[PDB]
Design a protein around this ligand. Structure first.
Ligand SMILES: CCCCCCCCCCCCC/C=C\[C@H](O)[C@H](N)CO
Ligand SMILES: [K+]
Ligand code: NA
Ligand code: NA
Lengths: 58, 297, 245, 58, 245, 50
């Protein structure tokens, strides 16, 4: 379509498939989000990574 | 044909408006470029001559050392349609049961949007305006209640017969446009074209509509512009018998496809009368707030 | 080279040695009406040199207590020269204007005038003071002729609008330590291609002191402000007998 | 579509993207305006322009 | 074009409409210390905009009887702004300076100031008058801070040397009929690559009236001289706690 | 590394002493050249601004 880029997610590393009937994109449906995850950001934010087989503190 | 040199080298008749300036695209605010120190004679961006009539051309970069800023801030919300294409109240019509005003089930309202201050102050920022409009009609009783009543709205252009009763033959509306709607239905809404005999409506007309002596008796016509007089909006309850309910019709206007010319200073005194800039001479107020001294906040 | 200037049109030449450039209102020079914007079908008359020339119409005295004045266009000129005659004999008229306001003092005098052009300058009244009376300005006030008229309440421009924002209109300042004149070129401004020179004033000229005139006792105390103007690209149509109102 | 050119903006140096279901164009939505600006018309209407570096009155 | 000037450094801009060019001391612009001239091994800190900017430090009144004043660098600034803080927290310091001395009067006033920079300006004493006492100048006199200090014997510059030859040093004159400021750019001058901002003043600034101030009774009698200066290319090293002396 | 523009276009660290003047060989006193009369406007070597 030919609307404005009003949505709160314009420039998000994940892309959506939404529906809209208005010139402003924030009026659009929530749609579908891509299913990417990065748990290491929270669960394993160590500088020097350690493998599963080794002893963590060597 | 023209043989004398002065007729040949004449610019009489040049119909091309020679413009000194031109519009450029500008979807975002201007960016900031890196700047450094300048210790130089001859070059002086900070110094100006306001007498010329232009605004200062000095920028952030030439007055202080700046970093680079990539500005993505949009300029879209300050276009004329963004500013004006919002519906505001421009008229209110009372159709009471008992009363002095419109007591007989019908009313004629001359179309004039200068009766309400919010809207009036915005449009008067410009001298000339050309636009289409969407009119919405919100009707209910004086308490805001919705009752089972049928109404008729009719647009009466200048020269068409204005109804003088709820039963006027004019309501046959064979050519004028009419809207029949129930108070129980959503607000009636229609699109209106740009209708002036002129190329634009003008909120200010420094003149008289007719020739002649301008004796004090007819000074109420100073500033009267027939080109802005679009006619009458007439409303009635649809019946030969009086309505059981007191009614109120609120009229909202939303401009669209707007063009404006000649900006002017914005109103700083209260409005007193419709289509005329009279202000209370005994209560001239400063444009804004005051303080006790120029050296303290 | 920004300070010296010569304006020559018709059989008249103006000189100034203390100018501050020239303002071309709304960045557009005056021009004749095109065949597509026009509506009236009679062939217009364009007198040229006999009407597009400078006319010096009036002189006011700037006093330490002056409020400011205004003139209306083309009203100021409807009774002057060949221009006036044409404006009277014809129903339709249109033209642009070159306005040159003059005021010189000395390097020991001070003060600053705001010289502005306000299109469609509708005058308001004080509404009986209390604001309850819908009174209207009389003819001599809306169209003062060559004499101009003095502002009663300059702050609201006798029309309920702030003079502080008048600079949103084509203007120049005559700041005595800098210049002695203001020059503004105005194109024809209207929502119609031609109009009546008598019933309608397209714009008003405002000359208002913002920084009051001052000088020490002993310096020439009579500081005149003279208004000189020239119609540009004048066209007239709809000919009949002469009419003044 | 195949409507009338009824809009108040027909012949405007700026083009719009509107929606309409009627034969008259003035019935259309406001749409989007192009984002062109000419501030010099009001802020710098001088006959002979002066640069930022120079002294305005020379 | 030699008379008008704008100096912008940091978040500060100075303008002048009656300048007399700019002097670049010893024909050399300030610069940072090279890796071959340097000796100290820690990585320096170069704060940039927060310290290389104009600081207006003091105003003196020029009177018909004024003797002249001096200020010492970087002493004048060791307690001012982010520059001062850095000069206090670090053992080592170095920088150049842009000095702008200001003094305007009127076309009816007269007088001439000599504005000069004298590197290693060692102050002497009158030796008990008879010259038999080896007395020494006190701290408030050798490093007067932002207030500066008044010369007791301008002819010998309070140091046994002729002010008549002070022009062998980077300088300008503020001769009222001509200009209203002096601008001198000084590179870092020392026999070492960096030094203590507290223990050593690299140069002194001298502002001395040579042709006395004069005017007729009735003309503004208060004629200030204001000193504004900006460090250029400042570098600091040898960090520890803050020290003022 | 430096990504912000102001760091890239920075002169912080310039260790080159930019000199406005330079030494020239001068083993003898300067010579005198023939000169004639000049009766001209605009050009004025005698006038200075100390
Ligand atoms: C069936 C219902 C139709 C209602 C028709 C409404 C037509 C309104 C036309 C818009 C007119 C714009 C306002 C014009 C002029 C101002 O109000 C004043 N006269 C200015 O003095
Ligand atoms: K941008
Ligand atoms: Na400038
Ligand atoms: Na010379």
């Amino acid at each position: 379509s030919h609307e404005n880029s009003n949505s709160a997610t314009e420039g998000s590393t994940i892309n959506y498939t939404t529906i809209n009937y208005y010139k402003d994109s924030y009026a659009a449906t929530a749609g579908k989000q891509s299913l990417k995850q990065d748990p290491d950001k929270f669960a394993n934010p160590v500088k020097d990574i350690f493998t599963e087989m080794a002893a963590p503190l060597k | 044909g023209d043989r004398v040199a002065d007729v040949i080298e004449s610019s009489i008749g040049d119909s091309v408006s020679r413009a000194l300036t031109h519009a450029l695209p500008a979807p975002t605010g201007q960016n900031t470029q890196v700047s450094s120190h300048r210790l130089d004679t001859g070059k002086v961006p900070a110094l100006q001559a306001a007498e010329i009539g232009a605004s200062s051309n000095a920028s952030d970069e030439s007055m202080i050392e700046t970093r680079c800023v990539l500005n993505s801030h949009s300029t879209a919300e300050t276009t004329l349609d963004s500013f004006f294409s919002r519906a505001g109240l421009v008229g209110e019509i009372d159709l009471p049961l008992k009363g002095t005003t419109n007591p007989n089930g019908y009313a004629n309202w001359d179309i004039d949007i200068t009766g309400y201050a919010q809207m009036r102050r915005k449009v008067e920022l410009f001298t000339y305006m050309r636009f289409d409009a969407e009119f919405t009609f919100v009707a209910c009783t004086p308490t805001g209640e919705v009752v089972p009543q049928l109404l008729q709205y009719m647009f009466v252009p200048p020269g068409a017969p204005k109804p003088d009763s709820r039963e006027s033959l004019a309501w046959q509306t064979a050519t004028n446009p009419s809207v029949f709607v129930k108070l129980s239905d959503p607000p009636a809404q229609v699109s209106v074209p740009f209708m002036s005999p002129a190329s634009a409506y003008q909120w200010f007309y420094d003149g008289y509509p007719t020739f002649g002596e301008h004796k004090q008796e007819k000074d109420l016509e100073y500033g009267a512009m027939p080109n802005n007089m679009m006619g009458t909006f007439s409303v009635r309850t649809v019946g030969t018998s009086k309505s059981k309910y007191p009614l109120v019709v609120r009229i909202y206007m939303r401009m669209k496809h707007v063009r404006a010319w000649i900006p002017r200073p914005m109103r700083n005194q209260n409005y007193l009368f419709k289509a005329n800039p009279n202000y209370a001479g005994n209560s001239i107020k400063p444009t804004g707030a005051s303080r006790t001294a120029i050296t303290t906040l | 080279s920004d300070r010296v200037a010569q304006l020559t049109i018709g059989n008249s030449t103006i000189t100034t040695q203390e100018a501050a450039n020239i303002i071309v209102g709304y960045g557009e020079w005056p021009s004749y009406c095109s065949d597509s914007d026009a509506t009236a079908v009679d062939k217009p008359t364009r007198p040229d040199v006999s009407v597009n020339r400078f006319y010096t119409l009036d002189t006011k005295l700037w006093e330490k207590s002056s409020k400011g004045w205004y003139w209306k266009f083309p009203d100021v000129l409807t009774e002057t020269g060949v221009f006036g005659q044409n404006a009277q004999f014809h129903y339709l008229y249109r033209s642009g204007f070159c306005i040159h306001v003059q005021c010189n003092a000395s390097k020991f005098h001070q003060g600053a005038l705001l010289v502005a052009v306000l299109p469609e300058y509708v005058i308001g009244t004080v509404a009986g003071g209390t604001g309850t009376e819908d009174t209207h300005p009389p003819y001599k006030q809306t169209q003062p002729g060559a004499d101009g008229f003095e502002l009663q309440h300059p702050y609201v421009l006798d029309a309920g609008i702030p003079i502080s924002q008048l600079t949103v209109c084509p203007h120049q300042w005559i700041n005595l330590r800098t210049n002695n004149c203001a020059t503004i070129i105005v194109p024809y401004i209207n929502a119609l291609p031609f109009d009546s020179a008598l019933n309608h004033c397209n714009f008003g000229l405002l000359v208002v002191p913002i920084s009051p005139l001052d000088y020490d006792q002993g310096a020439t105390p009579v500081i005149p402000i003279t208004i000189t103007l020239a119609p540009m690209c004048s066209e007239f149509a709809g000919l009949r007998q002469a009419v003044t109102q």
